[PDB]
Symmetry: D2
């Protein structure tokens, strides 16, 4: 029974060794997965920061060109209206 008792202590500490080793593999794999996901989030975070920051200068350029475009549009409408008015003048002159 003494031999069996020492055998039981040996078996127990072997089981503890394997349990700790396996749990270390599990923990390392888990933290590895967390690290990969946070890494991907970091990269994406930085790219979005880049695009968000560029939107300011891009919006300034857009506003400049959009003002110039509103100028061209108003000019065309006014040109066509003036055309109509001078045509009216010509027509009433031709009534003579």
């Amino acid at each position: 029974s003494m031999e069996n008792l020492l055998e039981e202590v040996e078996k127990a500490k072997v089981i503890a060794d394997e349990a700790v080793k396996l749990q270390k593999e599990i923990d390392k794999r888990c933290q590895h997965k967390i690290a990969e996901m946070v890494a991907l989030m970091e990269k994406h975070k930085h790219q979005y920061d880049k695009i968000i920051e560029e939107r300011d200068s891009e919006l300034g350029l857009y506003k400049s060109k959009e003002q110039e475009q509103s100028s061209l549009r108003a000019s065309l409408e006014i040109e066509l209206s003036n055309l109509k008015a001078e045509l009216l003048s010509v027509k009433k002159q031709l009534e003579i």
Copy 2:
């Protein structure tokens, strides 16, 4: 009267130009709005990511502390089992 035909043509050009300006603005603004929505989405995602990363960095000390406590418990168990085997060997030698 040919003057009436001219007035009709000018009014036609005014209508065409007006619809073209209206459509032009509509296309333009639709594009700008699409860009704005995508930028807003990317900003939300960026802030969520920044929050997760910040929480991980803050709690890293606590996680490492608990892991150290765990490895200490494992080592203590190994030591108690070794002492158990040693004292059992002592008792066996006594008998």
Copy 3:
């Protein structure tokens, strides 16, 4: 009195093992919640991106239709202005 030391050591080892299991359950719990939260976040983002990319197609169809309407309105304006010039020349030379 060495047997009492043996029983005390066995009870101590059992308490140690129980504390290791309790603490390890807290660790595994935290890792599981972290991975689950990040997977939920990335899956939500993946779906939102997929949706925007999916509706970009219909937005491109409407964009194409409206752009064709635009170019037709442009061509029509250029032609109406040319016909206008033609009749203006007709009246001008008629009155000369």
Copy 4:
């Protein structure tokens, strides 16, 4: 001369229209370009999330099997400690 400046106004309207089309093509080109860029970024990120989740999901079987084996080793350890306590009560009592 009211006809000469009518023809002149017609030519001016043609010119203004052509300008407006050029400027608007510039505007729409930079806008559609920005859209293309952000859509390509979202496509890349969507496929990355899909890939990383498909990997975790594919290895969940190995994870679950090693975790079950881990819980098996924990149970084995509690069983061995219990057997030890019992045989040590037996041996202790056989002495006294």
